[PDB]
Amino acid sequence: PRAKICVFCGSSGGASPAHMEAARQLGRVMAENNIDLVYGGGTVGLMGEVARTVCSINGPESVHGIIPEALVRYERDGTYQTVKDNKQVVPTETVYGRTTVVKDMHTRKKMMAEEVISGGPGSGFIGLSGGYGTMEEVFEVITWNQLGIHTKGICLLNVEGYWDGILQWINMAAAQGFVQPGNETIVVSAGDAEGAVRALREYKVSEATFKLEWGRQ
Amino acid sequence: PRAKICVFCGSSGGASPAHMEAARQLGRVMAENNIDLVYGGGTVGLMGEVARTVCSINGPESVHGIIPEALVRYERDGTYQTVKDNKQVVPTETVYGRTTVVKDMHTRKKMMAEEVISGGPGSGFIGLSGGYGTMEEVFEVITWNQLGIHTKGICLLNVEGYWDGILQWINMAAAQGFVQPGNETIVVSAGDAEGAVRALREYKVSEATFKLEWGRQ
């Protein structure tokens, strides 16, 4: 079973070029380590970029995008050249990999998460630069790790201190106890892509609790 | 139609007394303006405190808590003393208001959100100090405002600079364009409770877009 990483990132490209370059490098590092990609299914912005590079290196079978029925297209213009039996027009498989269309957002999040959770070692969630939606996704999978539903690691790919405020908040919440001790390390940050993939490979759920409790049992 | 505010906050009390006191004050201000409460349910932490004060001032009909079947109790104990026909044991109605039990988390979030959305003017979402789950809820309703699903305002009740890192991130994301212009103001912060209620009452969805586009028609 190959490792699978779900990348949460913006539909937009981002003001600084550093975000797009970070998307490229993340794609390159994931492809180099034979890690399959799970993502929102966009062809634009960081999403489209990661999908594009990963698919460029390792083919369509390497990338899986999950799209709700609401965001489906019914006419074959531009990047969308692949047509399903039901006449839904979807992003080009050769350029952006396989895509599944699900009815609602709920089963979409559930499917992406499920694919990551059932992946081999090194499988994890990565949050690249993004807006409100990627944040909701990241905190969702974080909450799921906290509830003991899954043991996969969660890494924030921090480009030019983009995620700094959130890490700051995590620290504050930890200090205030709203995040319980041993749960502060569910999410980790990385300066670069290799850092992030490495973080996902290294991650152990019981590690923080072990460090906390072992000397006292 | 009375105004309804859904308050998102941690099950834990918080290290500093300021968070709990803030829960009390929010309860008092909400009760004074005849604003009904929607919340996670339970009797412990900020949730329990807000529910407790609001119900203390304005009675059971004033508070609605929504609880998943998993968090139901089947035997009477402590704060949980009210038994439904189906023999589910729920927090005391006289102390903590009415509570509805739903199957899963999804329909729970949808129900709380629904109750806010169909409320009268001044209805809103408030994020008091909380962990990962409340964060996911807040960014969820923010995303829903962004998609045009609802026109209600979202306010972070900032206790001792608890939410500061998040506001910082919102500014950074706005600057980087991952939060589109006119969407940075979907969420606003408040130092005190009256501030928050005021913010929810004042909020207008098209305002930012108006400021952005009116000059360009």
Features:
homodimer; 217 residues; 7-stranded parallel β-sheet; 8 helices; 17% strand; globular
Topology of this protein?
2 copies of one chain form a homodimer.
Chain A: E1 4-8, H1 17-32, E2 36-39, H2 45-58, E3 63-68, E4 82-83, E5 89-90, H3 93-96, E6 98-102, H4 105-117, E7 124-127, H5 132-146, E8 153-157, H6 164-176, E9 187-190, H7 193-202, H8 207-213
Parallel strand pairs in A: 1-2, 1-7, 2-3, 3-6, 7-8, 8-9
Antiparallel strand pairs in A: 4-5
Characterization of this structure:
2 copies of one chain form a homodimer. Chain A has 217 residues and is α/β, with parallel strands linked by helices. Chain A is built from 8 helices and 9 strands. In chain A, strand 7, helix 5 (132-146) and strand 8 form a beta-alpha-beta unit. In chain A, helix 1 runs parallel beside helix 2 and helix 1 packs across helix 7 (193-202). Chain A is globular and about 60 Å long. It is classed as hydrolase. The entry lists the keywords hydrolase, cytokinin, rossmann fold, lysine decarboxylase. The assembly is dimeric.
In quaternary terms, these chains amount to homodimer
Coarse morphology of chain A: globular
Q: Report the helical percentage of chain A.
A: 40-55%
Beginning-to-end CA distance, first to last residue of chain A? 35 Å
Query: Could you please say which CATH topology of chain A applies here?
Result: Rossmann fold
Number of strands of chain A: 9
Helix tally of chain A?
8
Q: In percent terms, what proportion of residues of chain A is strand?
A: 15-25%
Level-2 CATH architecture of chain A: 3-Layer(aba) Sandwich
* Pair of chains with the largest interface and how many residues each contributes: A-B, 41 and 40 residues
Rg from Cα of chain A: 17 Å
Structural class of chain A: alpha/beta
Strand order of the largest sheet of chain A: 6-3-2-1-7-8-9
Number of domains of chain A: 1
PDB class: hydrolase
Keywords: hydrolase, cytokinin, rossmann fold, lysine decarboxylase
Assembly: dimeric
Entry title: Crystal structure of ligand-free phosphoribohydrolase lonely guy from Claviceps purpurea
